[PDB]
Amino acid sequence: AGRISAFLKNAWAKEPVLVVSFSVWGLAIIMPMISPYTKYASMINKATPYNYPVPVRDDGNMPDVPSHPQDPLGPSLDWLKNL
């Protein structure tokens, strides 16, 4: 649109602070929704170990959890290592 472009160009010439602020507001809204790294922040904060990992009893019916830290089982952090 001609009127919209002329208004935006006049605003960019005369008040180039509100234009920058609205553009930065829109960029800060849009950018988390299109970035591929958004899930990684939550996963990093999940993987950060602020508490002791309380061990569970060995009933012999869970094969998913490991038996020792030097095991292939468990949530390995190779994604963070290679990130």
Partner 1 sequence: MFFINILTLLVPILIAMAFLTLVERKILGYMQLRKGPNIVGPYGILQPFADAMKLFMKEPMRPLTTSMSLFIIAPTLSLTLALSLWVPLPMPHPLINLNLGILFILATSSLSVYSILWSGWASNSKYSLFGALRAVAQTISYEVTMAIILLSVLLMNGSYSLQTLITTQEHMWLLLPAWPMAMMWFISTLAETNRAPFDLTEGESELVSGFNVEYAAGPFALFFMAEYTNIILMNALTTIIFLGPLYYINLPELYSTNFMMEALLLSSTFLWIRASYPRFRYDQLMHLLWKNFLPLTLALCMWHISLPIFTAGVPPYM
Partner 2 sequence: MNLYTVIFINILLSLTLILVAFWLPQMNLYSEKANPYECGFDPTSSARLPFSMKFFLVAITFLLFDLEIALLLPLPWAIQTIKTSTMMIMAFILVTILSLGLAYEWTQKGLEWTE
Ligand X SMILES: CCCCCCCCCCCCCCCCCC(=O)OC[C@H](COP(=O)(O)OCCN)OC(=O)CCCCCCCCCCCCCCCCC
- In the complex, the smallest distance separating the C-beta of residue 42 from partner 2, rounded to whole angstroms, is 5
Q: Rg of the Cα trace of the chain?
A: 25
- Of 75, 65, 28, which Cα lies nearest the Cα of 20? 28
By rule CB under 8 A, what string of x and - marks binding of each residue 18-57 to partner 1? x-xxx-xx-xxx-xx--x-xx-xx--xx--x-x-------
The binder of partner 2 chosen from 8, 20, 24, 41 (CB under 8 A): 41
Q: Tell me whether residue 61 or residue 82 sits nearer to partner 1 (CB atom).
A: 82
**How many helices and strands (H and E) does the chain possess?**
4, 0
